[PDB]
Amino acid sequence: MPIEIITDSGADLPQSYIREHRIAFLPLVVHWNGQDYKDGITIEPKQVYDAMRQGHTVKTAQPSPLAMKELFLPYAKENRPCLYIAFSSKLSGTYQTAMAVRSELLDEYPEFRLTIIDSKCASLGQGLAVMKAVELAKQNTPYNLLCETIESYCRHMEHIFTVDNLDYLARGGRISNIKPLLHVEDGALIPLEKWRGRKKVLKRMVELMGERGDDLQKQTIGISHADDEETALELKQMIEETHGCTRFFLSDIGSAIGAHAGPGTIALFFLNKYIEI
Ligand SMILES: CCCCCCCCCCCCCCCC(=O)O
Numbered sequence: 001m002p003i004e005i006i007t008d009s010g011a012d013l014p015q016s017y018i019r020e021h022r023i024a025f026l027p028l029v030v031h032w033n034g035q036d037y038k039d040g041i042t043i044e045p046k047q048v049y050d051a052m053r054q055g056h057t058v059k060t061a062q063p064s065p066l067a068m069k070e071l072f073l074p075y076a077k078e079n080r081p082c083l084y085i086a087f088s089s090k091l092s093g094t095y096q097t098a099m100a101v102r103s104e105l106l107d108e109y110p111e112f113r114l115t116i117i118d119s120k121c122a123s124l125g126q127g128l129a130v131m132k133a134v135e136l137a138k139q140n141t142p143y144n145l146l147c148e149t150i151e152s153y154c155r156h157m158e159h160i161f162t163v164d165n166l167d168y169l170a171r172g173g174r175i176s177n178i179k180p181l182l183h184v185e186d187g188a189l190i191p192l193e194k195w196r197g198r199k200k201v202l203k204r205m206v207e208l209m210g211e212r213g214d215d216l217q218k219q220t221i222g223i224s225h226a227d228d229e230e231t232a233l234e235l236k237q238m239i240e241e242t243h244g245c246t247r248f249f250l251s252d253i254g255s256a257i258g259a260h261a262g263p264g265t266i267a268l269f270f271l272n273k274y275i276e277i
Contacts, residue, residue: 001081002080002138003081003083003137004022005023005085005130006071006082006083006084006085007023007026007086007127008028008063008087008094009026009038009040009255010028010091010092010094010126010254011087011124011126011127011130012123012124012252012254012257013124013127013130015041018040021134023130024071024075024084026067026071026084026094027040028061028087028094028254029061029062029256030048030059030255030256031060032051033056038063039060045252045254045255045258047255049226049227049262060092062092062097068097068098069105072101079112081113081114081143082114082115083115083117083133083150084098085117085133085154086116086117087119087121087122088119088120088126088184089120089187090120090188091187091189095118098116099116102116115143117147117150119154121157121187123222123253124223124224124249124251125158125159125184128249129150129154132150132277133146135277136149149275153275153277156273156275157269157271158184158209158212158213158269158272159269160205160268161181161182161205161261161266161267161268162179162181162182162198162205162265162266163180164179164264164265166180167262168259168260168261169189169260172260174260175189175190178194178195179194179195179200180193180195180201181193181201181205202266203238205268206238206239207242210242212272213271213272214273216243217245220247220249221236221239221247221248222248222249222250222268222269223235223236223248223250223251223266223268223269224252224267225250225252225267226262226263227252228265229250231266233250235268236248236250
């Protein structure tokens with residue numbers, strides 16, 4: 001059987017893509033005021049931003065171990081080889097929980113080939129890795145080689161972003177007129193710089209990309225935004241002007257991530273080592 005690719009809502013890939021490429025989907029949980037929702041399935045970013053915009057503190061949770069097991073079980077039974085590219089273990093306990101679920105399943109279904117990669121990635125940084133996995137899988141790339149390659153790919157992904165207010169991230173717990181510029185280091189969020197006004201952080205984001213990027217023109221640059229396509233499209237131009245990039249993938253930030261980053265969040269993703277896949 002062909003390798004089945006699995007991912008969670010931390011990847012920020014549009015459901016149109018998930019469904020098209022038959023990607024098993026594990027929704028992260030979004031909740032507040034007694035109601036639980038499933039990221040990308042029963043809740044949309046606007047509903048979250050709107051809630052926060054109304055003085056609400058939208059919270060998130062890991063999917064349940066039961067939910068995880070229900071998702072993998074079918075594959076274990078038909079004994080189909082799987083690759084689950086998980087949201088950064090430093091941003092959620094989802095990964096570890098899934099490894100636990102994996103052991104349980106192995107006990108019942110030995111021979112079940114399920115590899116879980118702790119991506120150390122978030123949003124489209126993770127999504128880009130998932131899309132590459134889909135490509136390698138449809139090319140019938142050998143299982144181990146495919147898994148090893150996607151892990152190396154994840155190890156070279158950069159996540160450079162800005163939010164409107166660090167309070168959201170702070171109250172969210174993933175971090176302890178100035179706009180902040182942050183980045184993802186080994187799976188964790190690290191506040192990096194402080195700039196006056198939006199225009200400058202965007203200019204600086206594109207600049208840092210040029211410093212860390214590798215063979216940027218040959219790469220598919222990822223850009224995710226918190227319901228602010230206008231700025232994303234703005235950032236896209238600055239990049240094609242400055243770096244001469246031609247391949248882009250823009251998408252909205254998911255609800256779970258959005259509940260932490262907050263409105264006005266803009267991020268770019270690229271490899272610091274051009275792995276040619
Ligand atoms: C445009 C996005 C750039 C990357 C931004 C990462 C922001 C940190 C997001 C943390 C989301 C936390 C999800 C927690 C899920 C859970 O409750 O286990």
